[PDB]
PDB file of C-alpha atoms and ligand atoms in Angstrom:
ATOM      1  CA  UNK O  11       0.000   0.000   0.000  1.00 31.19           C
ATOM      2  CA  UNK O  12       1.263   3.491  -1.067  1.00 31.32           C
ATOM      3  CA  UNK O  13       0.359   6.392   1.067  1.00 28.48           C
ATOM      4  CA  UNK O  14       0.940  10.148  -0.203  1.00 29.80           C
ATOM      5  CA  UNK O  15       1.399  12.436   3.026  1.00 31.05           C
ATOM      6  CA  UNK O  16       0.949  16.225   2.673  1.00 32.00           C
ATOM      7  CA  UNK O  17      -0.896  19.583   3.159  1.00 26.67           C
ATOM      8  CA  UNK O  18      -0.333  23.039   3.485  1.00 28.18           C
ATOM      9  CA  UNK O  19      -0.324  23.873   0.010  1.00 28.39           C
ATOM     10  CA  UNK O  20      -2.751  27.157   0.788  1.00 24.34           C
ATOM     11  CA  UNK O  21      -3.777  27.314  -2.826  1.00 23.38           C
ATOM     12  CA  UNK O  22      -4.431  29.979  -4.267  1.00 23.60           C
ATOM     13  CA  UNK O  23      -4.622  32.140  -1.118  1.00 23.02           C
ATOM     14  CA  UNK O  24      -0.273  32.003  -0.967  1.00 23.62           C
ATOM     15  CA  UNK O  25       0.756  30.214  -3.687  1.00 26.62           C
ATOM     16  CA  UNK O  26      -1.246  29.249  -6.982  1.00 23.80           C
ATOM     17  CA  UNK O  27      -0.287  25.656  -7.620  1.00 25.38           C
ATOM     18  CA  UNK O  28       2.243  23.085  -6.212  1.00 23.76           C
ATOM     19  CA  UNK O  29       5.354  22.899  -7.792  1.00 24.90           C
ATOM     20  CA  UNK O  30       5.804  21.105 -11.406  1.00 26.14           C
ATOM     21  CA  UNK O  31       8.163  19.236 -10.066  1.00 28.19           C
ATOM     22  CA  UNK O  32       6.746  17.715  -7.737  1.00 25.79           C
ATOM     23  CA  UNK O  33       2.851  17.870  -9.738  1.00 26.78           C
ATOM     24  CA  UNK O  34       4.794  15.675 -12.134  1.00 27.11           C
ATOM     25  CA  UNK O  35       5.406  12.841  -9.828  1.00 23.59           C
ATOM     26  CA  UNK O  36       1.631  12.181  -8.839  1.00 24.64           C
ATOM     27  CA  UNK O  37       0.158  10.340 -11.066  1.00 23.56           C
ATOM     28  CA  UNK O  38      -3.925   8.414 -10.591  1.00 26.47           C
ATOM     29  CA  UNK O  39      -3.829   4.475 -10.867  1.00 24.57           C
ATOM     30  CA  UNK O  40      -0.444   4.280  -8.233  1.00 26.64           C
ATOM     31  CA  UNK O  41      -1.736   5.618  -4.661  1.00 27.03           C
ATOM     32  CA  UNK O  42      -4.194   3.559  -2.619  1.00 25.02           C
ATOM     33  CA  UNK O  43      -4.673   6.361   0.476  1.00 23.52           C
ATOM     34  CA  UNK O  44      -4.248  10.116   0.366  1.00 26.24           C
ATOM     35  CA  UNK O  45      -3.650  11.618   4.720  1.00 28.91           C
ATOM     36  CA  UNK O  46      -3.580  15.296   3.853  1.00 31.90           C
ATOM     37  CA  UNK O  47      -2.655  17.530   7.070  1.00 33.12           C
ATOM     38  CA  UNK O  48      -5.163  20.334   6.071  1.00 30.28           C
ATOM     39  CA  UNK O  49      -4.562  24.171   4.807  1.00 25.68           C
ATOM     40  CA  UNK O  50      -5.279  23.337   1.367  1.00 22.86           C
ATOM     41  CA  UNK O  51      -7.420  26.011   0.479  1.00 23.00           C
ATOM     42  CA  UNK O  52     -10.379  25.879  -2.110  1.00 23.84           C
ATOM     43  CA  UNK O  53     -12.202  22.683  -3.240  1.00 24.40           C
ATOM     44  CA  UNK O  54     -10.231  22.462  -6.185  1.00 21.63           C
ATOM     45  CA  UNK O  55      -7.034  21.032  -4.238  1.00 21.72           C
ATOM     46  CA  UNK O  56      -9.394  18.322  -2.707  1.00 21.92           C
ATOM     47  CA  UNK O  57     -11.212  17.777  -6.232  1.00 21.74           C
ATOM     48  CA  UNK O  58      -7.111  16.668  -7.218  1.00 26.36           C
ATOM     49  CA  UNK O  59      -6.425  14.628  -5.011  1.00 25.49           C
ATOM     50  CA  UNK O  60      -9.268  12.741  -5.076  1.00 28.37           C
ATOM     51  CA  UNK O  61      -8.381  11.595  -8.670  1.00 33.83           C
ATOM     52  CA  UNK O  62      -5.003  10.442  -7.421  1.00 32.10           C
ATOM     53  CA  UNK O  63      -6.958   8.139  -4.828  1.00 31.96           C
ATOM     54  CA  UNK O  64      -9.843   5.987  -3.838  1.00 33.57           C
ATOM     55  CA  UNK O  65      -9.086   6.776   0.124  1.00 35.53           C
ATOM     56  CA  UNK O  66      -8.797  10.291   1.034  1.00 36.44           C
ATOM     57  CA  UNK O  67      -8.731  11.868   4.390  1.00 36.26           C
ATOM     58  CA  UNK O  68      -8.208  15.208   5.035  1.00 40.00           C
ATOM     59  CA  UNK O  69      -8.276  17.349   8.743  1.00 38.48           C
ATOM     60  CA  UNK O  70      -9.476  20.598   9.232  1.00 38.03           C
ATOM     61  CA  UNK O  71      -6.587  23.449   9.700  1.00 42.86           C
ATOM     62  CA  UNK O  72      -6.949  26.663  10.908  1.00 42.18           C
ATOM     63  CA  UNK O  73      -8.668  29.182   8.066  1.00 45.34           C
ATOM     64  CA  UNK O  74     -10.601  25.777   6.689  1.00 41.70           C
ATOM     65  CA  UNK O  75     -13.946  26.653   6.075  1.00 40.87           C
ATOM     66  CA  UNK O  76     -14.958  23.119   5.195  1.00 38.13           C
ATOM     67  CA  UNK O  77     -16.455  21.956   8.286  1.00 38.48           C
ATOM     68  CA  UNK O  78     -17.241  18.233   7.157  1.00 42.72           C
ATOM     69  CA  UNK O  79     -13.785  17.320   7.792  1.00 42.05           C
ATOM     70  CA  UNK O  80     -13.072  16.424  11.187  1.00 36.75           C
ATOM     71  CA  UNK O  81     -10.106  18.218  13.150  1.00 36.54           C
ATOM     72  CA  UNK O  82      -8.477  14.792  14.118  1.00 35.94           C
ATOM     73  CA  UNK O  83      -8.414  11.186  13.148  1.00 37.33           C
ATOM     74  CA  UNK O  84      -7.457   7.387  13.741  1.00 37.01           C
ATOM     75  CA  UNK O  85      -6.957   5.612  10.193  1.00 40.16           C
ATOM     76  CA  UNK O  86      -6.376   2.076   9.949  1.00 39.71           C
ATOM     77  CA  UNK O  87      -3.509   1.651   6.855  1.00 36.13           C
ATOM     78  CA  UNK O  88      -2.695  -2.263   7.247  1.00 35.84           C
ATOM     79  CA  UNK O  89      -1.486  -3.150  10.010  1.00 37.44           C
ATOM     80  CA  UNK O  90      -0.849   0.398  11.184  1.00 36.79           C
ATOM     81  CA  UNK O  91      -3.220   2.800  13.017  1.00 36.21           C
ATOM     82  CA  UNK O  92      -2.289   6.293  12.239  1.00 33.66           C
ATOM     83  CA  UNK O  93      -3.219   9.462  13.642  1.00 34.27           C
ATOM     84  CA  UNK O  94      -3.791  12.763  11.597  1.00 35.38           C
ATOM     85  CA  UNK O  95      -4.309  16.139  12.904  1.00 37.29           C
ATOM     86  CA  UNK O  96      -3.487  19.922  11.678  1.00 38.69           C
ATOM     87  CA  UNK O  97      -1.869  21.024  14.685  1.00 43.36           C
ATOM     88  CA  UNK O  98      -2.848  24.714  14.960  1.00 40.66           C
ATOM     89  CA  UNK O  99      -4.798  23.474  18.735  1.00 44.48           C
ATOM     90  CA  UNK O 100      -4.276  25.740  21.375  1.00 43.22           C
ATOM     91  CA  UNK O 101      -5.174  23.309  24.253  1.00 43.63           C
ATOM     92  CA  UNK O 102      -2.922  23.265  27.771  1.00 44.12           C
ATOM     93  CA  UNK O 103      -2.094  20.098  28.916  1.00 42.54           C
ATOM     94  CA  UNK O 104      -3.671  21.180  32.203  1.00 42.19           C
ATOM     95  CA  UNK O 105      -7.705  20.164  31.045  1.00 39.79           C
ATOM     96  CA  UNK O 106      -7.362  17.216  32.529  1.00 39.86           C
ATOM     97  CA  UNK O 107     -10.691  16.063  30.571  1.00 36.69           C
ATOM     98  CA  UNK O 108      -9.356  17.175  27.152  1.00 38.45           C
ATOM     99  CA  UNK O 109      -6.051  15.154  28.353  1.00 36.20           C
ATOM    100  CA  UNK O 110      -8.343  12.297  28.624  1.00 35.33           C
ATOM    101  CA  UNK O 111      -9.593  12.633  24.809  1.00 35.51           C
ATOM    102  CA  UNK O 112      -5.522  12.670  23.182  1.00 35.23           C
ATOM    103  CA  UNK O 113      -5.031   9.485  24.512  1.00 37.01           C
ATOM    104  CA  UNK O 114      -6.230   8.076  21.590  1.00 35.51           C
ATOM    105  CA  UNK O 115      -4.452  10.259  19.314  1.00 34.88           C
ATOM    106  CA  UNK O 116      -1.315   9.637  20.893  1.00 32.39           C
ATOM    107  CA  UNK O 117      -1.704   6.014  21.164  1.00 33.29           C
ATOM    108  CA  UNK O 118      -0.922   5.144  17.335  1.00 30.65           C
ATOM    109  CA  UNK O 119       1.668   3.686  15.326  1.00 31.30           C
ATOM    110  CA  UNK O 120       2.336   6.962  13.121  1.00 30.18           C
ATOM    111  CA  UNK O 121       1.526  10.396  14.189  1.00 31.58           C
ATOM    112  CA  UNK O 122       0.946  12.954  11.367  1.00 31.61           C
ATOM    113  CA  UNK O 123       0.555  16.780  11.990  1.00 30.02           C
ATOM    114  CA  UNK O 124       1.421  19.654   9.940  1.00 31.22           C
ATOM    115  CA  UNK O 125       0.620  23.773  10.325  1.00 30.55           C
ATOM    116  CA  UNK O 126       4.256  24.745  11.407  1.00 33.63           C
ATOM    117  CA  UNK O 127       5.115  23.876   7.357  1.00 33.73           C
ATOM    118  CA  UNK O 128       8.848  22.351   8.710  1.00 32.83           C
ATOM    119  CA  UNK O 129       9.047  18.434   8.048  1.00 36.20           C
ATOM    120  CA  UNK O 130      10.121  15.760  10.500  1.00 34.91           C
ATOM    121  CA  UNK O 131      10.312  11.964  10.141  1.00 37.86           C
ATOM    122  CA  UNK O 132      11.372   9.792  12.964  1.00 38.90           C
ATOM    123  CA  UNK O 133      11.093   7.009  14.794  1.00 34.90           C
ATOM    124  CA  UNK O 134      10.773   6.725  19.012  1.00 37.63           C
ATOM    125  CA  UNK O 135       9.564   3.539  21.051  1.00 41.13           C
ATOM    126  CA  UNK O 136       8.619   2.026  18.095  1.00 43.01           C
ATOM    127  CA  UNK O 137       6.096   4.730  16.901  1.00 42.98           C
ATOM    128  CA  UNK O 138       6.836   6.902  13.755  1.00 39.67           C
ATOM    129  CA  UNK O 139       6.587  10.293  13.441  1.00 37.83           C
ATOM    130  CA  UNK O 140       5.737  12.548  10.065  1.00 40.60           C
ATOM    131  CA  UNK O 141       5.266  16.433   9.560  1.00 43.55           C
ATOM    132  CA  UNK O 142       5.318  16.622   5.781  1.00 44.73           C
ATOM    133  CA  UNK O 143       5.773  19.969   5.819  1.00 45.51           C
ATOM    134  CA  UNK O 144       4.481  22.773   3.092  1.00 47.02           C
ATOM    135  CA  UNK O 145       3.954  20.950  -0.531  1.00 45.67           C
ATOM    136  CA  UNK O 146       4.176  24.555  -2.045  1.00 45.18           C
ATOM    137  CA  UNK O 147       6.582  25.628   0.241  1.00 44.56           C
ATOM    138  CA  UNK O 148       4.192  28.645   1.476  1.00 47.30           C
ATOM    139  CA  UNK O 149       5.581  30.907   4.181  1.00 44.26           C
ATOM    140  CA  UNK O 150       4.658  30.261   7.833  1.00 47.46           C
ATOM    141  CA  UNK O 151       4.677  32.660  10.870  1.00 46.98           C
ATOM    142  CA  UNK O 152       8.471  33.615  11.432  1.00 47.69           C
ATOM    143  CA  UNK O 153      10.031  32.274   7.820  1.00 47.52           C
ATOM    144  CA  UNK O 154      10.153  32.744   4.012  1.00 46.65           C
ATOM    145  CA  UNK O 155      12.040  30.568   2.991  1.00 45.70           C
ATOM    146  CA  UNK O 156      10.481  26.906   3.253  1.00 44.75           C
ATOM    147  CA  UNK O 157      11.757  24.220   1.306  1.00 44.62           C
ATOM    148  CA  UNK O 158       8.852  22.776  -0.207  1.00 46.64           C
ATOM    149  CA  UNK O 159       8.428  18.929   0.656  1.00 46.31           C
ATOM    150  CA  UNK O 160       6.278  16.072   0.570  1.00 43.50           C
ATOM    151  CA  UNK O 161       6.086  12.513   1.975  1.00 42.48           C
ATOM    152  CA  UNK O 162       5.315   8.910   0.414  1.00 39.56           C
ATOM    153  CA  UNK O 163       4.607   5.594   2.943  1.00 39.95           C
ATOM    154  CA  UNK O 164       5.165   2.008   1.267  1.00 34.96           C
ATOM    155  CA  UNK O 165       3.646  -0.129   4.005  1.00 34.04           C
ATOM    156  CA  UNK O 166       4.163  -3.820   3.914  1.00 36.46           C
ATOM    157  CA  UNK O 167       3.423  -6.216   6.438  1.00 35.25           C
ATOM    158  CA  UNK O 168       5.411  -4.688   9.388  1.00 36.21           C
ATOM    159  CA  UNK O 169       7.571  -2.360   7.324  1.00 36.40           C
ATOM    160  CA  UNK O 170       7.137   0.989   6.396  1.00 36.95           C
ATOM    161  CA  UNK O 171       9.964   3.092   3.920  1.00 36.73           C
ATOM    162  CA  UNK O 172       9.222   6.704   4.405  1.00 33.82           C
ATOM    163  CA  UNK O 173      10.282   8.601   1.023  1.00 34.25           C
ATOM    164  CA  UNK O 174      10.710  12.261   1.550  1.00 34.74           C
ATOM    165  CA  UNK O 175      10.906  13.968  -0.847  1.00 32.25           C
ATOM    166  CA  UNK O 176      12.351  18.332  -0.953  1.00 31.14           C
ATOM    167  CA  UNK O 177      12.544  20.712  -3.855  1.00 28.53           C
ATOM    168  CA  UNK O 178      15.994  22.037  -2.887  1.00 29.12           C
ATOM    169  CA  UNK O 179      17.480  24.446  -5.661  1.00 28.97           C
ATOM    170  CA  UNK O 180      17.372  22.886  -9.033  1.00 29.49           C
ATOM    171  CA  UNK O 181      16.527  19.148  -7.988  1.00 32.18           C
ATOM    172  CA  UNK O 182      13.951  16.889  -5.802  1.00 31.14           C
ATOM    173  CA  UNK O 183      16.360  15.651  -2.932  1.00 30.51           C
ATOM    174  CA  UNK O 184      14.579  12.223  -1.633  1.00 30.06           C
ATOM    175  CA  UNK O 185      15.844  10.573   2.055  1.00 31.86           C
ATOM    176  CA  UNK O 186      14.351   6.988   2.784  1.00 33.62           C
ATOM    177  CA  UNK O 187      13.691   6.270   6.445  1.00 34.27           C
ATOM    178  CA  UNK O 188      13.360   2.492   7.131  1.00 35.47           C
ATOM    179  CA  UNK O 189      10.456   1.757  10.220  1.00 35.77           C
ATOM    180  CA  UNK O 190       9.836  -1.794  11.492  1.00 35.93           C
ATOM    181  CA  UNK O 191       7.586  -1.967  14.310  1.00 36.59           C
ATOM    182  CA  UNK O 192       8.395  -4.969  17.143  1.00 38.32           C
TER     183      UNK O 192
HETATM  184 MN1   MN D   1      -0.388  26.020   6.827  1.00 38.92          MN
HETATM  185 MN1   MN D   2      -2.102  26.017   9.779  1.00 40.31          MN
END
């Protein structure tokens, strides 16, 4: 199973369409699940990637006016349960009800989140880790200058490869992160 990781493209709103480069590599017919972070912008991001998969889920950032998607979520991708939020939440750890509620977010084999528009990918106590950062590479609060990115999951069995992939000067830069869960 391939899984395409991304989001805050903020089309057309920052930037009017994600780089050709990596446009190019996404292709219908390959992709069997689409976990999009949220800050896409107008329907006609969603419209896209739902031709490029049969299984899309999307969260709700902040500035999304489409309330039908939920603000967090728990997605079953073989055998891994992976959770999917925006991450623009202002909640203190000190609501010791709300507290209650994360558990199950935290309590997944991947954790997606995205709104700072910086990508991470790593692995801790056997649980994997994703932001995907900015597909368009659109500015965030302090910074200019974000290296657009995007992230691809081949899950097999109890293996996932993480491709990410950057648009770094002239070229798309991929690293491969290997994750095998005891
Ligand atoms: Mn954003
Ligand atoms: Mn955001």
């Amino acid at each position: 199973m391939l899984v395409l990781v991304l989001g805050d493209l903020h089309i057309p709103h920052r930037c009017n369409s994600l780089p050709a480069k990596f446009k190019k590599l996404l292709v219908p017919g390959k992709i069997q699940h689409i976990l999009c972070t949220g800050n896409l912008c107008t329907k006609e991001s969603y419209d896209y990637l739902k031709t490029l998969a049969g299984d899309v889920h999307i969260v709700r950032g902040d500035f999304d006016e489409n309330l039908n998607y939920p603000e967090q979520k728990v997605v079953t991708v073989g055998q891994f349960k992976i959770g999917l939020i925006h991450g623009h939440q202002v909640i203190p750890w000190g609501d010791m009800a709300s507290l209650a509620l994360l558990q199950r977010q935290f309590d997944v084999d991947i954790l997606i989140s995205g709104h700072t528009h910086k990508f991470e990918a790593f692995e801790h106590e056997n649980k994997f880790y994703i932001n995907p950062g900015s597909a368009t590479g659109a500015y965030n609060a302090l910074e200019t200058n974000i290296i657009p990115s995007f992230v691809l999951m081949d899950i097999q069995a109890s293996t996932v490869v993480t491709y990410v992939y950057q648009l770094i000067g002239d070229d798309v830069k991929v690293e491969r992160i290997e994750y095998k869960k005891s």
